[PDB]
Amino acid sequence: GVAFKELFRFADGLDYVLMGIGSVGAFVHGCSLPLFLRFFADLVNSFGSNSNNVEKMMEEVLKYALYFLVVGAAIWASSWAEISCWMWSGERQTTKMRIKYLEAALNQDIQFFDTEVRTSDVVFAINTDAVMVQDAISEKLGNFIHYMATFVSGFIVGFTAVWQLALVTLAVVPLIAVIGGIHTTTLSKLSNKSQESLSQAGNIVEQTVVQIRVVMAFVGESRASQAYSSALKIAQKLGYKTGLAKGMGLGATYFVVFCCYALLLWYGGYLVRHHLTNGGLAIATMFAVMIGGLALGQSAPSMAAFAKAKVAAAKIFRIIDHKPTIERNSESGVELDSVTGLVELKNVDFSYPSRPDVKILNNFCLSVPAGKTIALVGSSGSGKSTVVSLIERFYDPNSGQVLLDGQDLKTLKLRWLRQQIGLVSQEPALFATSIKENILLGRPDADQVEIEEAARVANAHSFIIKLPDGFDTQVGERGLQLSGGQKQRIAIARAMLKNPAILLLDEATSALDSESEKLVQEALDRFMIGRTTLIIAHRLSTIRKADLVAVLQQGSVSEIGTHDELFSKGENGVYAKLIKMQEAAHETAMKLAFKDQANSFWRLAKMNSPEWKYALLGSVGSVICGSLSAFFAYVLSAVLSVYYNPDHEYMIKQIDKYCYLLIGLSSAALVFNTLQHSFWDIVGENLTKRVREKMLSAVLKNEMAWFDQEENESARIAARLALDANNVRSAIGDRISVIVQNTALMLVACTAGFVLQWRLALVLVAVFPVVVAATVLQKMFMTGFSGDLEAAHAKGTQLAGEAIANVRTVAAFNSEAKIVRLYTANLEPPLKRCFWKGQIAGSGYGVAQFCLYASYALGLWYASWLVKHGISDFSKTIRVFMVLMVSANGAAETLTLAPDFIKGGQAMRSVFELLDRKTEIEPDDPDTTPVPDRLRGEVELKHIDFSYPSRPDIQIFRDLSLRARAGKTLALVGPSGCGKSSVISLIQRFYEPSSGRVMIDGKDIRKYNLKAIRKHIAIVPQEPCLFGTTIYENIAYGHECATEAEIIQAATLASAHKFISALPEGYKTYVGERGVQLSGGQKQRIAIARALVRKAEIMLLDEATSALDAESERSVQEALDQACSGRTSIVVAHRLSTIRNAHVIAVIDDGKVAEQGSHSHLLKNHPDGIYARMIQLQG
Ligand SMILES: CC(C)[C@H](C)[C@@H](O)[C@H](O)[C@@H](C)[C@H]1CC[C@H]2[C@@H]3COC(=O)[C@H]4C[C@H](O)[C@H](O)C[C@]4(C)[C@H]3CC[C@]12C
């Protein structure tokens, strides 16, 4: 870290007033409970000692009952000024911190984002590094003066009332403070392994849904519901050891608390007998020391957060004051009257300042004629990506000069130079703002007329009107994700608005289809006229339109000519041979109601009924654990009553008895606290395992189209099965154990209260809920109010994360201050809410603490009123008060019930909607026609019409009639694919045809059950798909009982035995993300070998393109030959040599098949057709 006192470097006039008030109001609040104890110790004394004079009893109890109404008013006005003046004086600082961080973070030169700090590291420093700082100066500095003043004032009132009893308590506190620290560390040692064991076993569902296409293609989907259950037991046996360590950490805290009070009370009963101590002063000292002695554990997080908030604050202050390395505010920058578009480059040598050894630019000399179309054509890595940055002057040249009308770049003003240059990037840059503000970045002062003119030139105003909101259409989280062509058109319109004289087209349409580029190119051509423009094209059509073509080679200009001059030198030149890898880059890449939320509880708690022997031995340990929080507060008051008896002989006999219950029935709290938390952790841990695999057995049952709804992504079913299944643990088992535990407490408190005096046990019950409601707020104060810091600043941070990441586009235009202005204005709406939240949470806590102490001035006065009128006395009216008022601080365990308590039916609806989801394709359909033995295997199709269910508009198949012969070959080929593969999907019944018939040996496939017809199809996916397990169990994923010889045969036939046996481990070699990575030409081999383990009659060899190894294919072709040896093979390929041995070759284009036959039959009727003309396109 940097230092303390450096975090408060953004303070202003109000930040020395809010901290100067929230430090006095938090110090007065801290020293108010150890003073209420002092007042209580004096009220009781003048309430039992003056039994012979009721008259003095009444003016000396009313006074101390009116002091309570002042102690409770000094907390209403002292908790308001602490909770509200600390959450606001941190919000006023951590906002000016973030504004400065962003303003000085995109001011840095682009070298900074590569040489020193990654572009993804900075976005982290706003998400978390600006939250760790705020939480350690707003809410955790105020919880430090409070818990230090409480500790300081916990000894002044203790050692000055009865010092001889305040030392025994000091000799006791460091025992509770050690047991309660060991228990909270043993729990953390076990709460960090369950997550590991649930995320190592929770990746099975992550992997399964990604490759559901091959998981469902084979029947091995029952191998994913038992490799997912046998990996949950690891997190279940470990989930049983958390309950035991939670019960033996609460049965040992009470075993110490009872014993220590079994000695403090005896010593207090010894002091009183010898006349050194009052009756109440021996009680408000044990409490006052233990309150001020345990007030250091709550001061541990406050100092633990002061260390993280400096190692997380040094990074921000590093960037904030770091001066850049280029003189941006260039007052020493020359100016030019009017440019003519003349650019010269002479002897420019440059290298990246990340590996200063390459020579990307060597002895570069190039002249840019004014008003002409100079195009850059070359291979990857031969330049055309550094010269564009150098004219923009992103990196200053290492050695060399660039002349723009005869003056050096290091001599003009940077902001003016970047004003006359128009840059169009290959990705459009849009920020979280409206369409209108996304174009004003070009120039601020433009009116609406010019913007609309530019938009209608940009082929943009056509769909602007079609958009509902028009120019105010908010692009960002909303905005329906407009198309890439439209995205490019907005940026192009922004470029026209700037109206530059020099234009840099760097890969304008390098990643769009021919439809959008058709619209874009003509607009660029209209915007081309009258401008010195340098185009880096990707298609030869624009190069044909280019005036000059200067081809770089190894960073130097090699070939200079035109479109026609360069092509005249034949294939021997680079210009003609560039077509081969130019045109190949296109085809290859292409709400409650008590009836809906009652079934959710009740249907859930019916399948959780094989375990009633464990939910019935947890309602006993919850009753004799709630009957001991009332047999302790009752003894703690029955000792106070006997302190005032004038007969010392009788007083000892009762102190002895009550010191033998707190020692005796302490083992009954040690034992019965390991039956409540150790038997409610078996009921609540087997329900989750049963509900986490009922969903998987249903997610593995939906239709193939259900996974293409764009809501069922890869890691979002895995998130629903891991975040909506951990909230069911706290719904049944963890809430019956709190209702019963607290029902068994108010039945032992209100019995011992009603037996003695029923006129006081009725009044105290009437104001009983306002005591527990006030005490719960005393435990939701330690964690802190206004949590969840990062989600409040989640709308503005999108602008930061999309603006600093696209720093090049931000700095190309001079919009480095017009984004700070947009980022400041999106932080005030949270700043007008975090203040009212602080006021509300301050007032609602102040009033709920005044109304608590106002209820201690109504019981203690009514007792004194009863005593005068001869109804009761001090003995009976002080047990009723103390029992009923301490079994409300002992009744505040409703805070400690894994306090979720509200996700409830909100999370429970998703679980039961997934279970109750129907499937229109039955995976295993009973009452079905029977499946024969080894069949003929003759696939036939009849008038097939088909389209994707997601897009039912484009009918791809239109009366598709095709028949696979009796096991010979049905090679399907054709150009313009992406839809040819639908025959593969139709046969495995992934999708349902719109209209048609699928005959297998002359029979419809809907009459067959789905899980047996798949015992005869062998699928080979195009993309190498091997699961994260060793080689042995990837090949074995195609059968049931695979012997060693069978797998060895499968490996040998696919030519995989040699390589696998050549590996170090052998068949046991581990493959996957966390292991060995192999070559794709071999990963296809393993897939083919897996295919020949089924011994199927129908083989669906999908395309194996995007891989070339002639020696590998020399064996792969014959491996396919015996893979096609008398078996019905429908092969879809791209290379015509692979279909030379095909018996039936079908050409499928424009949705129909017309050219069918073999090599001899097709070349006879179609000697000049597509099948014959595609041939010559390329020992
Ligand atoms: C009814 C009132 C007159 C009475 C003073 C009462 O309000 C009082 O504030 C009660 C609720 C508190 C004050 C101090 C508390 C105790 C604080 O000191 C203790 O010994 C701790 C130790 C341990 O952490 C126990 O879990 C709670 C336990 C044992 C608390 C039990 C409840 C109290 C005794």
Side-chain angles (χ1 to χ4, degrees):
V2 175
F4 205 76
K5 96 190 158 63
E6 196 74 355
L7 306 174
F8 314 101
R9 58 170 287 178
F10 298 109
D12 53 308
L14 274 83
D15 279 318
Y16 291 156
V17 175
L18 307 190
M19 332 185 91
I21 288 172
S23 302
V24 161
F27 178 84
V28 175
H29 182 207
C31 295
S32 82
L33 183 55
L35 186 65
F36 161 72
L37 288 173
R38 175 66 201 179
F39 290 155
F40 173 69
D42 289 13
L43 197 150
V44 181
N45 182 32
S46 180
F47 180 50
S49 299
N50 291 321
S51 65
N52 304 319
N53 192 2
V54 181
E55 202 55 86
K56 193 164 70 176
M57 144 181 261
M58 210 84 57
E59 331 85 340
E60 261 186 350
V61 166
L62 183 60
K63 178 196 295 181
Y64 293 83
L66 285 181
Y67 284 175
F68 285 169
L69 304 178
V70 175
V71 171
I75 298 170
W76 178 67
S78 171
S79 293
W80 193 352
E82 167 187 356
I83 299 194
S84 164
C85 292
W86 274 116
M87 305 189 351
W88 181 234
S89 196
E91 206 71 21
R92 283 182 40 90
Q93 285 164 344
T94 321
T95 282
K96 278 189 286 297
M97 171 185 288
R98 291 189 239 238
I99 291 204
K100 291 293 291 293
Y101 179 63
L102 177 63
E103 199 188 13
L106 54 95
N107 196 10
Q108 298 299 323
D109 309 344
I110 316 172
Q111 331 186 359
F112 181 118
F113 293 102
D114 272 331
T115 73
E116 181 173 356
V117 175
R118 294 339 308 161
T119 193
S120 295
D121 183 315
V122 171
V123 189
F124 174 36
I126 293 174
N127 189 345
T128 282
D129 292 337
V131 169
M132 271 156 178
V133 156
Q134 175 173 359
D135 204 10
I137 48 184
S138 69
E139 299 176 1
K140 284 185 182 296
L141 191 62
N143 305 359
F144 186 86
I145 296 110
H146 176 22
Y147 283 109
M148 284 295 116
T150 292
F151 151 70
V152 165
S153 178
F155 289 173
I156 314 293
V157 79
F159 282 79
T160 57
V162 181
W163 65 272
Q164 300 167 356
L165 181 48
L167 269 83
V168 185
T169 316
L170 253 71
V172 154
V173 176
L175 217 55
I176 305 170
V178 163
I179 303 291
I182 289 325
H183 159 63
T184 64
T185 279
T186 285
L187 264 197
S188 292
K189 273 191 177 179
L190 261 297
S191 178
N192 279 315
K193 297 186 183 69
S194 77
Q195 302 145 331
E196 191 272 336
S197 181
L198 284 176
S199 295
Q200 186 173 355
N203 63 347
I204 283 270
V205 75
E206 205 181 318
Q207 202 185 170
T208 306
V209 300
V210 169
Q211 303 170 312
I212 195 64
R213 190 154 293 168
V214 47
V215 181
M216 258 172 109
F218 309 104
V219 153
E221 58 189 356
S222 178
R223 277 88 166 272
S225 177
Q226 81 172 3
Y228 186 68
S229 64
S230 70
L232 280 166
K233 301 179 78 71
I234 295 168
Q236 188 190 3
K237 305 301 211 52
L238 180 148
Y240 289 173
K241 282 185 279 290
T242 314
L244 209 65
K246 199 177 167 21
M248 271 155 48
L250 268 77
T253 304
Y254 290 170
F255 187 73
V256 170
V257 170
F258 285 7
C259 284
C260 296
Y261 276 88
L263 164 68
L264 296 176
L265 291 175
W266 183 94
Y267 197 66
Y270 169 79
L271 294 180
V272 169
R273 198 152 333 101
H274 290 284
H275 302 284
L276 312 86
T277 278
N278 204 237
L281 288 183
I283 293 287
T285 303
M286 321 185 318
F287 292 160
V289 167
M290 290 265 199
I291 282 172
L294 296 181
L296 264 78
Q298 284 96 16
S299 167
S302 323
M303 218 144 189
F306 286 170
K308 291 184 286 184
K310 296 190 283 187
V311 304
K315 304 178 181 66
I316 307 172
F317 295 149
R318 160 148 84 99
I319 285 145
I320 287 173
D321 263 8
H322 168 238
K323 169 199 204 273
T325 172
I326 287 145
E327 161 48 71
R328 195 266 166 197
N329 301 314
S330 177
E331 291 327 281
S332 293
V334 309
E335 282 290 323
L336 293 176
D337 174 17
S338 65
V339 305
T340 186
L342 202 31
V343 180
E344 291 178 353
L345 286 85
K346 32 188 261 305
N347 291 316
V348 174
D349 284 324
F350 163 105
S351 63
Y352 273 10
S354 299
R355 291 193 297 274
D357 67 338
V358 197
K359 183 68 180 295
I360 302 296
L361 292 187
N362 62 358
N363 71 356
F364 189 80
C365 297
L366 177 58
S367 178
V368 181
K372 288 294 181 182
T373 307
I374 309 93
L376 286 185
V377 184
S379 65
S380 178
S382 64
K384 74 183 176 64
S385 294
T386 308
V387 64
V388 66
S389 299
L390 185 96
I391 321 165
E392 202 86 350
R393 201 195 169 185
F394 280 359
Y395 319 100
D396 268 303
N398 289 116
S399 66
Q401 291 178 355
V402 178
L403 278 303
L404 174 61
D405 294 339
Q407 314 70 3
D408 197 3
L409 267 63
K410 290 187 180 182
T411 60
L412 320 90
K413 174 63 151 213
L414 187 60
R415 84 171 291 281
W416 181 97
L417 180 40
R418 290 177 182 173
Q419 201 92 351
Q420 280 95 24
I421 313 319
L423 159 56
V424 172
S425 96
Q426 93 184 19
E427 47 296 356
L430 323 191
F431 305 112
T433 202
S434 75
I435 290 280
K436 178 180 173 178
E437 307 138 340
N438 280 321
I439 179 156
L440 271 293
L441 288 178
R443 175 184 33 251
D445 61 356
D447 57 350
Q448 300 301 86
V449 180
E450 286 175 349
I451 300 167
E452 295 176 356
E453 182 36 40
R456 67 189 107 141
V457 181
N459 284 319
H461 186 71
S462 69
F463 71 93
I464 287 175
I465 310 167
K466 290 183 180 180
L467 287 170
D469 300 333
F471 280 114
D472 302 67
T473 308
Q474 296 293 137
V475 178
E477 176 68 29
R478 298 281 84 81
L480 68 98
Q481 278 71 240
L482 274 42
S483 69
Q486 286 186 357
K487 265 168 168 86
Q488 293 253 30
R489 282 189 284 174
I490 311 168
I492 293 167
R494 179 166 60 201
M496 282 100 77
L497 158 50
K498 189 146 154 196
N499 191 3
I502 303 163
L503 188 181
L504 311 192
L505 275 175
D506 194 359
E507 311 315 1
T509 68
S510 62
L512 293 176
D513 55 351
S514 65
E515 161 276 308
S516 294
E517 86 178 2
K518 182 176 179 179
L519 307 170
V520 173
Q521 189 39 268
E522 46 89 8
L524 319 194
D525 292 333
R526 335 180 269 182
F527 187 57
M528 213 310 295
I529 303 167
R531 293 177 183 86
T532 297
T533 310
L534 184 146
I535 298 89
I536 305 77
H538 186 270
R539 280 189 179 272
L540 193 59
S541 67
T542 308
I543 308 167
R544 188 174 180 177
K545 296 174 183 177
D547 298 332
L548 291 174
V549 182
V551 168
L552 269 71
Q553 183 34 270
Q554 294 177 357
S556 67
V557 183
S558 66
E559 299 174 356
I560 299 169
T562 69
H563 172 76
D564 293 332
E565 291 175 354
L566 295 176
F567 189 77
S568 66
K569 291 182 180 180
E571 292 184 356
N572 294 319
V574 188
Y575 180 80
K577 75 167 66 70
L578 277 171
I579 309 304
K580 299 293 185 289
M581 67 174 282
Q582 183 186 4
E583 68 187 1
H586 298 88
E587 301 176 357
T588 305
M590 172 85 178
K591 190 60 67 178
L592 275 68
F594 292 157
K595 292 291 184 183
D596 201 5
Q597 222 158 311
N599 282 322
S600 296
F601 296 92
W602 210 105
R603 282 183 53 236
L604 176 67
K606 186 164 176 309
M607 96 182 92
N608 192 0
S609 305
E611 286 152 351
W612 77 81
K613 298 186 265 74
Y614 303 149
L616 204 64
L617 299 180
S619 295
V620 166
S622 289
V623 158
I624 304 114
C625 279
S627 292
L628 298 182
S629 298
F631 296 162
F632 167 67
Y634 169 67
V635 160
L636 210 58
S637 73
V639 179
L640 186 56
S641 289
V642 85
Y643 273 146
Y644 285 101
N645 258 29
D647 193 5
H648 292 164
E649 180 68 27
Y650 170 78
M651 181 195 118
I652 310 165
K653 308 222 206 145
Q654 306 297 318
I655 304 297
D656 277 339
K657 188 188 76 177
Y658 292 127
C659 288
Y660 288 161
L661 298 183
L662 259 52
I663 283 179
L665 66 87
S666 76
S667 296
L670 165 64
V671 165
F672 279 123
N673 258 315
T674 72
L675 293 194
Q676 170 183 5
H677 297 278
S678 167
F679 276 156
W680 280 116
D681 225 14
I682 297 176
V683 178
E685 207 87 24
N686 289 326
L687 176 56
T688 303
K689 185 185 183 292
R690 198 179 298 145
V691 81
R692 269 177 168 167
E693 60 195 5
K694 280 184 180 291
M695 301 195 258
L696 186 70
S697 166
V699 180
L700 259 79
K701 203 168 284 183
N702 292 332
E703 308 105 2
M704 181 57 30
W706 187 81
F707 297 101
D708 280 330
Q709 285 190 1
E710 295 297 326
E711 71 178 2
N712 302 319
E713 317 289 23
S714 166
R716 294 183 181 277
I717 292 109
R720 177 219 291 262
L721 266 73
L723 257 46
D724 280 23
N726 89 11
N727 294 323
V728 80
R729 194 171 170 306
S730 307
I732 308 301
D734 305 338
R735 281 218 317 239
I736 308 298
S737 152
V738 166
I739 294 171
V740 174
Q741 181 172 356
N742 278 317
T743 305
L745 179 59
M746 281 155 208
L747 253 60
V748 200
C750 292
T751 289
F754 266 83
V755 159
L756 312 178
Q757 183 59 40
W758 66 267
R759 302 196 183 199
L760 191 59
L762 280 172
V763 177
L764 292 176
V765 160
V767 296
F768 188 79
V770 309
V771 179
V772 62
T775 321
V776 168
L777 295 176
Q778 293 183 357
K779 293 142 183 314
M780 298 159 6
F781 174 82
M782 271 163 238
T783 76
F785 299 99
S786 78
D788 175 75
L789 283 309
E790 77 286 334
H793 307 285
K795 166 54 171 323
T797 194
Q798 222 83 16
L799 182 52
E802 309 322 325
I804 191 158
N806 310 9
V807 47
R808 330 170 53 80
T809 315
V810 164
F813 311 139
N814 288 313
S815 71
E816 73 187 12
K818 298 181 284 183
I819 303 175
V820 181
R821 196 171 73 236
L822 261 203
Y823 189 55
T824 297
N826 288 134
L827 281 180
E828 265 150 19
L831 254 68
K832 305 179 150 274
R833 185 75 215 162
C834 198
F835 162 59
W836 294 109
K837 190 192 289 187
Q839 294 290 324
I840 284 176
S843 281
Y845 186 85
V847 80
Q849 289 295 318
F850 174 75
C851 286
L852 171 59
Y853 290 90
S855 67
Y856 293 160
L858 190 62
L860 281 169
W861 171 78
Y862 201 51
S864 72
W865 196 78
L866 291 175
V867 173
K868 188 150 155 252
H869 297 290
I871 299 165
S872 183
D873 43 351
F874 177 71
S875 293
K876 291 183 282 295
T877 45
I878 207 62
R879 288 183 286 186
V880 168
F881 182 86
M882 289 262 296
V883 166
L884 266 300
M885 278 314 158
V886 183
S887 321
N889 184 289
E893 92 264 26
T894 60
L895 187 273
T896 310
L897 42 78
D900 167 328
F901 196 78
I902 51 173
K903 314 262 161 43
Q906 150 69 32
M908 269 201 267
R909 264 172 291 91
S910 174
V911 172
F912 288 100
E913 83 161 270
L914 183 54
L915 268 72
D916 296 334
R917 205 264 182 191
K918 276 83 150 184
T919 73
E920 69 184 358
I921 288 100
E922 286 285 334
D924 192 4
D925 187 74
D927 191 74
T928 322
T929 65
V931 184
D933 197 0
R934 311 268 83 82
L935 74 172
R936 184 85 280 280
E938 187 175 2
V939 152
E940 186 178 1
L941 281 79
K942 291 182 180 181
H943 323 87
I944 301 302
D945 282 18
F946 170 73
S947 163
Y948 288 101
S950 68
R951 185 142 54 261
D953 322 276
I954 306 168
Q955 310 321 100
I956 299 299
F957 287 164
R958 295 174 183 175
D959 212 317
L960 185 61
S961 297
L962 187 60
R963 173 172 321 87
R965 304 302 329 296
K968 266 143 296 179
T969 294
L970 200 78
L972 301 203
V973 295
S976 179
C978 292
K980 289 165 61 182
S981 298
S982 295
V983 280
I984 303 167
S985 301
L986 290 177
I987 299 169
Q988 313 154 10
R989 204 175 170 178
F990 280 165
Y991 302 157
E992 193 67 30
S994 302
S995 67
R997 292 174 179 174
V998 174
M999 319 329 296
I1000 205 172
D1001 290 338
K1003 188 176 177 181
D1004 194 2
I1005 70 169
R1006 310 205 42 234
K1007 306 291 182 66
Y1008 274 111
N1009 82 33
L1010 194 57
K1011 287 191 179 186
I1013 197 62
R1014 281 169 177 165
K1015 284 332 181 183
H1016 303 102
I1017 317 320
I1019 165 176
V1020 177
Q1022 64 180 20
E1023 183 280 335
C1025 285
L1026 266 75
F1027 292 98
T1029 286
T1030 66
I1031 291 309
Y1032 194 11
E1033 311 56 38
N1034 269 319
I1035 294 268
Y1037 204 90
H1039 201 252
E1040 300 292 327
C1041 47
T1043 73
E1044 280 311 3
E1046 283 171 350
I1047 301 173
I1048 292 167
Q1049 159 279 342
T1052 38
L1053 283 188
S1055 298
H1057 173 67
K1058 189 174 182 179
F1059 157 46
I1060 293 288
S1061 297
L1063 282 181
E1065 295 291 327
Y1067 286 113
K1068 284 293 335 190
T1069 302
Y1070 176 77
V1071 46
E1073 289 186 357
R1074 303 169 184 173
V1076 179
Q1077 292 185 358
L1078 296 173
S1079 65
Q1082 292 167 350
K1083 304 253 281 183
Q1084 213 64 7
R1085 186 170 262 161
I1086 328 166
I1088 299 167
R1090 196 214 291 124
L1092 304 309
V1093 201
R1094 294 187 70 85
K1095 314 155 281 291
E1097 294 86 1
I1098 310 94
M1099 327 276 266
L1100 272 285
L1101 280 293
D1102 174 24
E1103 64 206 350
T1105 67
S1106 296
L1108 70 160
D1109 194 357
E1111 286 61 70
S1112 291
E1113 324 323 325
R1114 282 172 183 173
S1115 68
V1116 163
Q1117 189 54 46
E1118 39 203 337
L1120 291 184
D1121 154 32
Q1122 36 279 39
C1124 297
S1125 180
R1127 322 160 92 83
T1128 322
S1129 301
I1130 290 53
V1131 278
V1132 46
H1134 185 273
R1135 177 26 41 211
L1136 295 177
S1137 65
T1138 62
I1139 64 163
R1140 284 300 310 101
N1141 287 321
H1143 319 177
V1144 176
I1145 299 171
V1147 180
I1148 296 170
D1149 295 337
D1150 62 54
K1152 287 182 181 179
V1153 47
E1155 294 177 353
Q1156 63 65 20
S1158 64
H1159 212 37
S1160 297
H1161 192 277
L1162 287 175
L1163 286 182
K1164 184 177 180 180
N1165 295 320
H1166 282 307
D1168 293 331
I1170 311 164
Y1171 170 75
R1173 179 60 178 163
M1174 292 326 74
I1175 296 167
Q1176 286 186 356
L1177 284 175
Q1178 291 184 356

